Ligand binder design. Structure first.
Ligand SMILES: Cn1c(=O)ccc2ccccc21
Length: 130
């Protein structure tokens, strides 16, 4: 119905806003764009599902997230990809990992403070029924 279309529109507005806030944080600059295959040629061969915040924005806009849980799975994927691709003890790898964890923690903290749980439940139930 139009009431359901309005729910999902509110979801998209909410998710763009959260993603924007992550995207303008200087710690998370590394996560704002897809990894450049010139800059990092073995990335695509190691990491099977690349994800970054620009792509998250494209996915919102393509109506790919029907719940906040589905969004958080992609935020999780940014983080897990960074942990897996950069596993070593050296400071380069530790910096990116720490940033990856801070990205994930921040996304979850914003959603905990700002997402109404009954709004998420509504989205899940509309999604369950389609
Ligand atoms: C996320 N990420 C990595 O996980 C590894 C290298 C790299 C290089 C440029 C930008 C992002 C990058």
């Amino acid at each position: 119905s139009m009431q359901e279309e309005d729910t999902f529109r509110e979801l998209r507005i909410f998710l763009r806003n959260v993603t924007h806030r992550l995207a303008i944080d200087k710690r998370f600059r590394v996560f704002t764009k897809p990894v450049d295959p010139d800059e990092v040629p073995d990335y695509v061969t190691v990491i099977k599902q690349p994800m970054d915040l620009s792509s998250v924005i494209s996915k919102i806009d393509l109506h790919k997230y029907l719940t906040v849980k589905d969004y958080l799975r992609d935020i999780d994927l940014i983080c897990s990809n960074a942990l897996e691709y950069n596993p070593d003890r050296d400071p380069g790898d530790r910096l990116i990992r720490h940033r990856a964890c801070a990205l994930r923690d921040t996304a979850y903290a914003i959603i905990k403070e700002e997402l109404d749980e009954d709004f998420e439940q509504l989205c899940e139930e509309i999604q369950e029924s389609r």
